[PDB]
Amino acid sequence: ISAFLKNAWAKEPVLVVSFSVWGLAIIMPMISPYTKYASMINKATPYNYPVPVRDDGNMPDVPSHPQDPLGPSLDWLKNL
Amino acid sequence: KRFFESYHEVPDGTQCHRKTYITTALGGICGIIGSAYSVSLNPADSTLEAVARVGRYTFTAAAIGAMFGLTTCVSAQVREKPDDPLNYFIGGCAGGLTLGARTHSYGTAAMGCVYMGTAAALFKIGKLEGWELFPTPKV
Amino acid sequence: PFLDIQKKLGISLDRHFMFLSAEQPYKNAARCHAFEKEWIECAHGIGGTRAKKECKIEFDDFEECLLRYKTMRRMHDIKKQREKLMKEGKYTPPPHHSGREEPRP
Amino acid sequence: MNLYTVIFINILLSLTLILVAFWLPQYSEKANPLPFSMKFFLVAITFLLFDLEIALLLPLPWAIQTIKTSTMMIMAFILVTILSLGLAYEWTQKGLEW
Amino acid sequence: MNPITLAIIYFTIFLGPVITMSSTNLMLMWVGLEFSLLAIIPMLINKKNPRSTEAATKYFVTQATASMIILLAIVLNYKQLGTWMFQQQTNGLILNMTLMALSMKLGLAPFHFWLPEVTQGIPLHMGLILLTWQKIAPLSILIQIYPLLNSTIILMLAITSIFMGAWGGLNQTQMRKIMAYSSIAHMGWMLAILPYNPSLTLLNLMIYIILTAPMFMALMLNNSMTINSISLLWNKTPAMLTMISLMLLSLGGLPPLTGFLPKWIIITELMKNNCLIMATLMAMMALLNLFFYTRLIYSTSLTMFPTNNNSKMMTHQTKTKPNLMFSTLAIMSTMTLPLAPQLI
Amino acid sequence: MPSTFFNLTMAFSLSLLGTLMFRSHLMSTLLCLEGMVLSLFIMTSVTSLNSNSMSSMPIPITILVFAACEAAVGLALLVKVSNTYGTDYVQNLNLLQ
Amino acid sequence: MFFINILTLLVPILIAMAFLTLVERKILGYMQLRKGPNIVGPYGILQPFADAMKLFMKEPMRPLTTSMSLFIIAPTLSLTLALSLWVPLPMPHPLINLNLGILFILATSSLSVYSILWSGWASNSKYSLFGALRAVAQTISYEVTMAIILLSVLLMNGSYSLQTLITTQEHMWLLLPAWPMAMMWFISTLAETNRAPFDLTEGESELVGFNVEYAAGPFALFFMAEYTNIILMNALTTIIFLGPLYYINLPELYSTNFMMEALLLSSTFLWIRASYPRFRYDQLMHLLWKNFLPLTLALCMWHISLPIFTAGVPPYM
Amino acid sequence: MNNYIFVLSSLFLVGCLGLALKPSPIYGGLGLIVSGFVGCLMVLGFGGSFLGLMVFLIYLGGMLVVFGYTTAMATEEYPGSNWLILGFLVLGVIMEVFLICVLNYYDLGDGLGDWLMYEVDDVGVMLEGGIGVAAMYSCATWMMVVAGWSLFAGIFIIIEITR
Amino acid sequence: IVELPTLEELKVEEVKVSSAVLKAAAHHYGAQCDKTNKEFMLCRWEEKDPRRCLKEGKLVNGCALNFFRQIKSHCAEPFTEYWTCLDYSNMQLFRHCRQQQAKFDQCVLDKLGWVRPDLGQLSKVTKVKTDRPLPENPYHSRARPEPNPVIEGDLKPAKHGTRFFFWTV
Amino acid sequence: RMMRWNQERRRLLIEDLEARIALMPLFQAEKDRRTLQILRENLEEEAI
């Protein structure tokens, strides 16, 4: 099997690449340290406006002000 | 449509003119439809030939319509009994006869008379007994 | 439907997007999102035979949120009126028509 | 608008240039100057079943920015693949071969 | 057929009706109908005989325009109600379109011309699929929308079909077309009760499937597309003569056999709903269907037609057997009547 | 839109009358058949667009994708016919009578 | 002054094309060791005006064409589109801004196919019909390889806007990420002009193609529209793959460097004409259907992953 | 103008009437290619850049072109002068005007007013077709799969028919 | 008559400054003038009506003009050089006027004590406390109809059996 | 270099979109009172 690839790399040297990159692209996402961020860098974009919720005093996390230390702070996207 | 219905509104045997006119139209309408199917399928040879067939079927049907209307109305008039399947049967009887003639066949007149008249009579009964056709689902 | 292999399997490949008030992409609500809601939370638990007479206020409204025809008749009528009066000068293009009137932010 | 003006001007230029072409000049048998290409038709619907392929692949530019990026990737790969396997069958069928 | 292709097609011919049935978004119901159209056309031209190409080209045009009309109904609804599905409010014309269109794909009544002709040019096998696994899909769409369709039209298409089917059948001598005509008729009864009791449509179908599937595998056991051909059944295979007799009389409504139940309960439901005008006329010409069924009975069983000498040669050779399905579907069909209450 | 939606609908009916009144060549029909799919595609896209119903835009295209193959099948039947008769006239398709 | 823009957008491409007829005769010449035009002007600078002012004066013989309607709509379609694909071109400042720009360029490019179909069919002839059918096969087959190269690449600049390709290239040319795409793009721009080692149509030695029955004006236009998108499909490579400088200030530098690379890619096609024996019609297809299309589809799959795993999903807008 | 759409709509009907008189197989292809151009334009009118261009990209040059293609291969036998058809077509050109006319006097009407772009966000982004068509990959991934099988089994259906 | 506020009422001093300057002083307009702008939104999304939160609207049109008024006295000239280059672009990118940005930020870091937010500190959903009573029955939904009643009990073998035709079952 | 750069175009977009977040209140307030000034002013021209 391994020496059959040798003529298929000498002659037919196209379909080899096309079935070597067809796949390579299926394994790069499953094995990369940085694939988690694509659904996150794309999740941070505030395209529409963030509606604020009414305060009850029962919500400690919700950052009261845009500059509170609380809330979704992305010091990640920076120097991702 | 308020038109055709009128036929029923006035008591039978009365205002035959309207009756005959309405009945003649229905037959004629059927004539057109019938000729249409007869021309669409089993087409003709020349446009004129087919226009003729439309005419033939239309007139024949219009005739059966008229005599039905006329006979039933008059039979009721002369007989003075407005509600009677027999009036209609005589009418249907006549209608069939016109069909028979247009088709130039005594035999057809036979079946035509019996079958057609019976059907019309049943229409009268249907109206008299308030039979419902194509009823809405009431389960 | 005829064979509910979807509810059974719990999958929802065909139900999530059947009405205008379903989840629109990027939460961009469509026109009438208000009504259709009001006309389907009404007809929920009440079968159709009775979603057709008593829940008629919400469809008569939703039939005019989307067709938006009764409006036309209003506006179209208004239009004609203006026309007739204007022809006899009874009515004059409003200051708005004259423009200006302080178009503001 | 501007686009209209341009595309329209672009037409007028084309027409004029054929207007002038048939008029500037101002018999002799000067004017005197088939089987089915089944292969061609095949190639043609191969292109139809593939052009529509692109039409379902053009959303990628705007789906890459979907939250469920993992889902897009998966959905796309299958399309590109199932279409490649189709082409591949054609290859074996030798339909691709001319 | 490269067995792979056979799989893809057959899967589609089977994914086609199944998507229709399972989905509620009408659109997805339309593409279920669309697939079925695409999958059936390859099989129809398998012999690729000159008759076949004619068959498929008709089936396809009739199927395609109807498919487009069904889509138009969905497109129109989308603008009369944002929903992608018929509702109480739906404009009446919107639903009537769907009835006509779907009555073309199913081939009922004044649109009954394509079916007899495509049933004539396709093999006996693909004949069955074209008659019974392609009726499930459209009927599903109708049965789902029954509450909303018109009682008048359905009835007219119902009655017409019964008549056309019966009258057409009387003259036909080609078996494939006799069956095509019967299917038009039975399809008629089915659509008659749809507005009133859909659940009975699903009985008048199954029974039709449990009756027609054995009947066709019978016609092909000896691959006879002629009555003269089925008449020499007594020499080619004598046993099937008994059940072929009962199944055909079962297809018509005669009382001891299973075939009476669909007609009986449809008549009971229509009288319960007061259509004693319509039901009566239907039952009467239904009796015309049995006449042509019994005329075939005469030729195949009650009378023995003369056979050719070479028939002795075919007897010698072992007859490839009829699948088991024939039996299980012949008996469950010819005699289940004693078990009607649980069927309905 | 209400006005226009009419034109498109009648376009579909004019295309309907076309496919239901054949004349010689079949390729004309199939071509007409396609005229409907365009009218349906245009109407579906139009209402989806003025209902701002983006969840439904998938459909306008699914309609085209299915319609294209549908037509592919239709043309292969057509090629099959002018290979068996070579004239593609709806006229000779009558063996099944 | 919008009209001033068209007048300064169509004159400076019909006056450029004209001198590509010249430059396609001299560069080919000196490779053939033969001077091109030298005489009508100083160095042939005045030759296209001659055969411009000459072809149009030859009898536009409508040779018993089946339908003039086509004979005279095909040649106009072409120059109409070709001179339109320039309207959304992404210079530092495009004549018109069109989101969906790259689609526009793709779509309009496609319509051109008709010119081949219509012209071939109208002019009744074996050669004409033969060439057309064969020619469009090529054109259409190459659209499917262009689109993907076009699509694939998009995932990288992340929008269909030509005008963003410049930004995506603010610090690098996309030739280096995608030279495989740029190879097959070059052939899909070199063979979708029915040009080069790939001139199957207008096969001259074998076929005498579609434009055969065309002469004088009707021909000129068909021609003018083959050299006015011989400069497009190189002008795109100078936008999509070769990214010149763009500075908010000095907005010419881009156009100047756009020049320097579009002439090479317009002068690179000229080495081809003078270098490669023509592909045979079967081979051309097998180049796309069995070699390029596979690589193109796989690399498209590669580019949809690259953003996700490199987390480089481009910014919409 | 305001009748930006109507006029076009009218042109779309004219092209459909041309296809309906069933003109010569390829002369009418043009007809489709014309109304496809027209329908491409209307959708653009409503802001469906993507959906619009899509039609101009697939049905226009993909489907239609292949159609005529085949016409040339067969069913372009090019054996009633289309001119007769054009004669009738002209009749319809104004005959349709008649149909519209009755409702014209009856009169929506007076051209086209605000019967387009009913509601648009005067602020905001991501509002654009192609965001909806890209729901094939999020929240509408069943339409995508079934379209796949169409095209995929399409290959197998076509070859099988061809063979 | 549908309630439509009097034009007089709608009158409010207005920002009237082109989009470019707003885009320049926006990130500081998110830091400052936030409590006065989020409560408008919190009315706007809760109370779906522009005929009721006009109260807080006039507040937004107020705090903003306040924001700039300080910038006009404090650190106006370096602010003019900032948006004057930013408006030169075709999409008003911060990517270009990046030197003008710090020169305005250090001028405003020292004076007025403002610090420009970090990257992701305007996309978080702050919780704003307000007093507006919760708008119940928003959408003015007329009372819904009742569900069909529920037949209740347990199944018992059917009465007298399938009541079909003489099937004593 | 296409990794490290397109990441930045994202971070510039967040910078560019959060600007838009800060000015929805001013615009939505102006847009409310503006369209709420058109149709009292059109209510008049219809009523006045």
Ligand SMILES: CCCCCCCCCCCCCCCCCC(=O)OC[C@H](COP(=O)(O)OCCN)OC(=O)CCCCCCCCCCCCCCCCC
């Ligand atoms: C409700 C009652 C309904 C009616 C029941 C009575 C009728 C039953 C149906 C009969 C239909 C066919 C009539 C004609 C049959 C002709 C048979 C024949 O020609 O003989 C050959 C045939 C096969 O031959 P083979 O078995 O292979 O060996 C002999 C080879 N010469 O030889 C055979 O086929 C042998 C096997 C024949 C089938 C046997 C059936 C026996 C009768 C069944 C009665 C059931 C009564 C149920 C009563 C219910 C009351 C509630």
